[PDB]
Amino acid sequence: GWTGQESLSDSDPEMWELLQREKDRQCRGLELIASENFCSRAALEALGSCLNNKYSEGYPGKRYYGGAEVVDEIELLCQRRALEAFDLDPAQWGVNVQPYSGSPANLAVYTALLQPHDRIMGLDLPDGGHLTHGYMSDVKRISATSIFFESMPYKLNPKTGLIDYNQLALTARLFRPRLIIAGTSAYARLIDYARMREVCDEVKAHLLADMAHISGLVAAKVIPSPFKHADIVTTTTHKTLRGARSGLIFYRKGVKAVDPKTGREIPYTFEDRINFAVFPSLQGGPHNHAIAAVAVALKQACTPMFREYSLQVLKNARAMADALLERGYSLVSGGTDNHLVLVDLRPKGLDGARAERVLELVSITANKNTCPGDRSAITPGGLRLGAPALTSRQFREDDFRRVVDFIDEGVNIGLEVKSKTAKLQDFKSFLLKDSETSQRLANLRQRVEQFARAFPMPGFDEH
Minimum Å distance from CB 424 to a second copy?
14
φ, ψ at 159 (rounded to 5°) = -65, -65
Cβ partners under 8 Å of residue 399, min gap 6 = 390, 455
CB of residue 389 to a second copy, shortest distance in Å: 9
Q: Which is nearer to a second copy, 54 or 206 (CB)?
A: 54
Q: Which of 81, 178, 197, 239 is catalytic?
A: 239
120/295 with CB nearer a second copy: 295
Compute the least distance from the CB of residue 153 to a second copy, in Å. Answer: 16
- CA-nearest of 343, 345, 355 to 417 is 355
CB of 357 to a second copy, least distance (A): 7
The counts of H helices and E strands in the chain are 17, 17
Based on CB atoms, which residue is closest to a second copy, 98 or 437? Answer: 98
Neighbours of 99 (CB within 10 A): 29
CA-wise closest residue to 182 among 170, 168, 169, 196 = 196
210 is catalytic: yes
Query: What's the alpha-carbon Rg for the chain, to the nearest Å?
Result: 23
- Pick between residue 194 and residue 305 the one whose CB is nearest to a second copy: 305
Tell me how crowded residue 60 is: count the other CB atoms within 10 A of its CB: 14
Task: Sort 66 into a burial class: Cβ within 10 Å, 0-12 / 13-18 / 19+.
Answer: exposed
Q: Of the listed 141, 155, 245, 318, which one is catalytic?
A: 245
What's the half-sphere exposure (Cβ side, CA atoms, 13 Å) at 66? 0
Q: Is 57 a catalytic residue?
A: yes
Residue closer to a second copy, measured from CB, 66 or 328: 66
433 in active site: no
C-beta neighbour count of 92 within 10 angstroms: 13
Q: Give min distance, CB of 344 to a second copy, in A.
A: 19
Short-list 41, 46, 35, CA closest to 23: 41
Which stretch of DSSP H or E encloses residue 181? strand 179-181
With 0-12 CB in 10 A as exposed, 13-18 as middle and 19+ as buried, what is 463? Answer: middle
Catalytic: which of 111, 132, 145, 236? 236
Respond yes or no: is residue 236 known to be catalytic.
yes
Q: How far is the CB of 141 from a second copy (least distance, A)?
A: 9
List the catalytic residue out of 36, 45, 57, 322.
57
Shorter beta-carbon distance to a second copy: residue 236 or 338: 236
Residues taking part in catalysis: 55, 57, 210, 236, 239, 245
